[PDB]
Amino acid sequence: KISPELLQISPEVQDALKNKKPVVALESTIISHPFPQNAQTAIEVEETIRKQGAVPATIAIIGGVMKVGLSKEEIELLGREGHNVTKVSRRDLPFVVAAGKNGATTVASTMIIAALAGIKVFATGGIGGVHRGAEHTFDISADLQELANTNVTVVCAGAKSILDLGLTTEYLETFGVPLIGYQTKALPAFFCRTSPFDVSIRLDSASEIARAMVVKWQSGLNGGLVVANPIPEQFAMPEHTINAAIDQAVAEAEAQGVIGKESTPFLLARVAELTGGDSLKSNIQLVFNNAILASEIAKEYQRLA
Amino acid sequence: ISPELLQISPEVQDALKNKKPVVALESTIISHGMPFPQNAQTAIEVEETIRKQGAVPATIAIIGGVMKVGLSKEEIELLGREGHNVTKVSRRDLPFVVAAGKNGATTVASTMIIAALAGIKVFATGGIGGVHRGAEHTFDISADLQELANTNVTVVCAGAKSILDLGLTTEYLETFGVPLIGYQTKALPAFFCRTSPFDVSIRLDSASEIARAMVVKWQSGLNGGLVVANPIPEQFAMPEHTINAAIDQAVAEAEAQGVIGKESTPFLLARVAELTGGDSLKSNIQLVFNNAILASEIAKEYQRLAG
Amino acid sequence: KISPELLQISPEVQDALKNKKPVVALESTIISHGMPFPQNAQTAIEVEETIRKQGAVPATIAIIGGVMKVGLSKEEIELLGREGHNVTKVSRRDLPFVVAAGKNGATTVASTMIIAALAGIKVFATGGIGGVHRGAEHTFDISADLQELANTNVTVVCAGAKSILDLGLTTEYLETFGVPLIGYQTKALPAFFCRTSPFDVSIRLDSASEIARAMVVKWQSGLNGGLVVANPIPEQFAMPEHTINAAIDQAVAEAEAQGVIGKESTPFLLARVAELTGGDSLKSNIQLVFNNAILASEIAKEYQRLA
């Protein structure tokens, strides 16, 4: 019911939706906040979904327009413009659209536009969450509020390892958001395969996920689901190594007063140089791994109409 | 919505059609809340209390994957017998127990949800979940508070369960715009005790005023529920110093043993019963009857205005 | 479609809304609670005049004899100003009870947003919003204003959050809940009495036209919630940084020492600060309200041009 000036759904996605084919949304923030590994790794993510028997929709703001599904040139535009592209959460969305700017959507904002377009399934690396020190700083991702209110299943590696996972798990419960371990009781640690922390429920198949999605929304329980999909054991980072870098990066952000939306990008960029780019490599792989699972979920859900 | 998902018993259906006042009840107090037989038999007696007050009880649970509004004696026994084998079900758990054809005992959050689906506006319980002790560090905060923020049901209780942090819970309710009504009390009752150092948001002396405020609240578009805090009858109340000791010890022990999540409340209540030689349980039972009685009057007074 | 028993809009305001004239809502808490008599009613009446001089139509909002009123006479304004703290301070949680019992009440930002939204008014001018209190990471004291800004579609023009609060935590809280914090011609978040602070707004916008356009896009895109427009106090009416801060710090330590909590906090703090500053903080407060009313009117005119 929304104006075409505000929101444009691409021909392929529009068609995939027309023909009731499985569609999987993707976020644009990851691919702004590292060229060339930026625009390239995004192109392959889509192909990964295409080879799975599903349809990719990468989501972004371009020229003040909310776009569902992008083109190679658009992807390239976002990858090269880099940090010069505004990072867009819920509170940012109206201003980029109004001012006709380009923007890269976080999980919260990608969920929003996905929902507007009727897409129930969304794949990313990791969700935002409660940051370390949040009991003091109140720094808590808008992603969690979006998850609370907006009906979309986000497939991820868990919360980004840079966050406070224990606080995050409590937060999700409080707000009624299912945290689903895929073939795991233990909450996947992003880079690491497990955590000291447990998911809310373990489900062993995409079909069981899709079936729960259907029940959830048919019962009117609005809000999304977190599917925590652990990283392949071969692409995992060694615990002491990944966590030593993270701990140091976190501590450096404090000394330097990094706050607000810049925190996550700063932390990940630091951790990436502190591991010599090994953390990035793992980040790329979990993305692929999530896009595959996301594709299965999407088709099962399509089956279940 | 689908009868595959949600089923209302004939007794409850007849009540809603004929506009007789209905009082919802939770099932988590039947399985995880107390022990057998004290669970099943008490649950049955609660229903009878409501009936004797001239209202219609609807106990809510998930049976074989079905959200049920109103339960047979058989079903109540099942939940009571199965006990801790039954999944404790809050908002986040609900979709999975239904999908997998399982049994579940519903918390305040879950019961509110199902009640609302049924058009039941009044719900009696022992005490609500809340902000936990230490939550400024742990973020352990019941999904009950978020349900009260967003779902239109009046929940009649003895306040929040006193194993929790009452001060933080009263701030939280305020922030989320939930009325905390003292029934014939300004002091917030604290479960087993009549008083606490804390206040409700408003004192009201009659079921009639409460029902009037419900109609006004919801006709003005202010979605969310209401907490009615109802002090335990004097004869069943527990001495402050005695119950507060047992609670402090149970809490300190939960933390030493690394108890967390949904297991916290059941663990704490069970330990308090131990430490009080079963007395806290006896009080928990009496406060539930008391709330069922008040809830019945509120439902009567609400139904009188509503339809 | 709200019952006329609950909600009454003044003939002028209703005429303006029908004819698509720009309307600015005003709160009543600043009248009864935020400021002393006579300076409170005097201020409130002259605010309405200010809005009129800017080509818009003021609507002061309060609860009068149990009725939510949009637009008030000067007597009603003066009644609220004279009765003072005898008038109930009404947030979201209080609203149903004052309306139900037929009482008078002065609306905070939260309940004013609610009533404005019911009347279809998109722009609301106030002094400063509630927010996260100092020590809230411990106390959980967090204004219901923030939750209302999260879920209700009204642009609130203020001088920031009142600086008696914890501004850093408030900025974090607003982001989590998806609420734009707009600097009018400023990068730094102004703090009430003070033009700047250590904190930044979410976005800087230099014209009322830009704010109006963002509002249309936000709401046409289905992103429910309000917007904070933080408008710095004009430099000549500003408090000296060192002086106002010593006053606030002391008032805050005193409120804590005296065990002042809950809804009495903000009015206690502002009164104490006025005492400590010799009425100077009040003078700044009155001027920033005028200045916000001016900007609010421009925003309303622009929005009306778009919508």
Ligand SMILES: *C[C@H](O)[C@H](O)[C@H](O)COP(=O)(O)O
């Ligand atoms: C990493 C993923 O894009 C996630 O949504 C963002 O990092 C969230 O960032 P913030 O909005 O919580 O800062």
Ligand SMILES: *C[C@H](O)[C@H](O)[C@H](O)COP(=O)(O)O
């Ligand atoms: C006691 C009552 O059923 C209440 O809803 C539960 O204790 C809440 O438990 P939790 O969901 O907060 O763990």
Ligand SMILES: *C[C@H](O)[C@H](O)[C@H](O)COP(=O)(O)O
């Ligand atoms: C000052 C402004 O009216 C603000 O809304 C109130 O002071 C908020 O008061 P509280 O609800 O946070 O106590």
Ligand SMILES: [Mn+2]
């Ligand atoms: Mn943040």
Ligand SMILES: [Mn+2]
């Ligand atoms: Mn908990």
Ligand SMILES: [Mn+2]
């Ligand atoms: Mn407060």
